[PDB]
Design a protein around this ligand. Structure first.
Ligand code: AGS
Lengths: 342, 106
């Protein structure tokens, strides 16, 4: 039977009422408008399930826009003699998308289960020529667990940050981009203010690249930025974007990038070398392998879904202290004073 | 008496009027909307007492957002064909939360 009988029309006039349920029925039953919106939960936006009939065949812009609302209103009014306000149609579209919501990262991580291969520990070791050290394995594993935890337990306490040191072409940025995929982000250069939290909307793995030496202020800025676990933005209810799914990785050119003693214990440097990388990050980091690595991280984190499980091992942390001292400025004056005292 | 008989209905046209008392009665006496908001007195925001039926079970987000008001308006319209305003529903939600206000630290 036709769905027209479901529409609520005014008894006196037998004309459709400009009502939320009428719009819901039309959007969920009209052939031209049937199920062409969905909710990108990670990006917190309204994407298109399919191209509507008012777009070009090869537009490749799968985001709902204002003119899509214009065309929806025009089509509804053309077929059905009811003129819906733009606010009502936007509200109905938002609700319908939220009903058909999905998570792309949660889909990819669970796209395929994890067989036993143990890829999480040798992420940057065999791809960027790092050292087969306990600290490297532990911190890379904990970083991948932190990434998948921020995906699954969105608002979580994970203030650590892998920092990769290497030459101009060791492929650290390439490897980070391969890991991030569509949700990799590098277009973040300032870290203090309010609008920065808007730049994190569709980003999962955010990379901070240090070409020239950062100023003393920028290090404190990135500390206070990665230390946050919540973001606040905005048309009512203040829409506190609590999740903060982002996980941060830095890529530095200078060997000695640590200046303050405050920043230590949170920046976990890894020294990447070339000619010793078993697998080329330009050819071997494929979506299948990174998906399997994230599935392995999911398994390990789900073995203990807690922020305390994202912290390093005790001996791993104590020798991370040694690494952080080996990557910091020396101040060169304690030795001279020691010689004077001796 | 059934709570639906308390609703103030326009005697001329036998339709519910978009008044604040009707919204308050519906929110206080609807199983899908019975007492799902509260007011945090420390951080001045409205939070969720429980999880509404339109939210995923593994949500862990307890901030009342615009989509929650959208779903409240849509559900009230579906059940009682009233079509309350966005601002009126926000006002009634805020009043209901303030009726169940709390201080988290206290
Ligand atoms: N097949 C390849 N594809 C891409 N880049 C390649 C390839 N072979 C060599 N390269 C070089 O590898 C480097 C790629 O590094 P990038 O990821 O762009 O940046 P990076 O490695 O992080 O170095 P910096 O210090 O951050 S600029 C470039 O210098 C390329 O010229």
């Amino acid at each position: 039977n036709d769905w027209k009988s479901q529409l609520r029309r005014s008894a006196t006039t037998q004309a459709l009422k400009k009502t939320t349920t009428n719009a819901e029925i039309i959007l969920c039953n009209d052939e031209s408008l049937k199920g062409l919106v969905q909710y990108d939960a990670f990006e917190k936006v309204t994407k298109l399930k399919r191209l509507p009939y008012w777009r070009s065949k090869g537009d490749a812009n799968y985001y709902w826009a204002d003119i899509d609302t214009t065309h929806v209103i025009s089509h509804i009014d053309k077929l059905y003699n009811v003129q819906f306000s733009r606010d009502l149609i936007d509200t109905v579209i938002e609700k319908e998308a939220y009903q058909n919501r999905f998570h792309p990262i949660k889909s990819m991580i669970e796209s395929k289960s994890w067989d036993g291969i143990k890829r999480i520990e040798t992420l940057f070791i065999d791809y960027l020529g790092a050292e087969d050290n306990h600290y490297n394995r532990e911190v890379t594993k904990k970083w991948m667990m932190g990434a998948v935890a921020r995906i699954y337990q969105p608002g979580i306490k994970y203030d650590s940050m892998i920092i990769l040191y290497g030459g101009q072409g060791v492929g650290k940025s390439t490897a980070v981009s391969k890991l991030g995929g569509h949700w990799y982000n590098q277009s973040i250069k300032t870290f203090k203010g309010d609008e920065v939290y808007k730049k994190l909307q569709g980003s999962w793995i955010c990379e901070i690249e240090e070409l020239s030496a950062f100023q003393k202020s920028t290090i404190e800025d990135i500390k206070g930025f990665i230390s946050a676990i919540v973001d606040i933005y905005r048309y009512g209810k203040r829409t506190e974007r609590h999740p903060r799914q982002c996980v941060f990785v830095g890529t530095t050119n200078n060997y000695e990038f640590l200046k303050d003693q405050t920043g230590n214990r949170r920046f976990f440097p890894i020294t990447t070398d070339k000619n010793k990388a078993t697998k080329s990050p330009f050819d071997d980091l494929t979506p299948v392998v990174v998906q399997q690595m994230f599935a392995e991280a999911r398994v390990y984190f789900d073995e203990n879904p807690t922020d305390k499980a994202l912290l390093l091992d005790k001996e791993a942390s104590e020798m991370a202290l040694k690494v952080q001292e080996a990557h910091s400025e020396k101040d060169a004056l304690v030795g001279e004073i020691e010689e004077f005292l001796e």
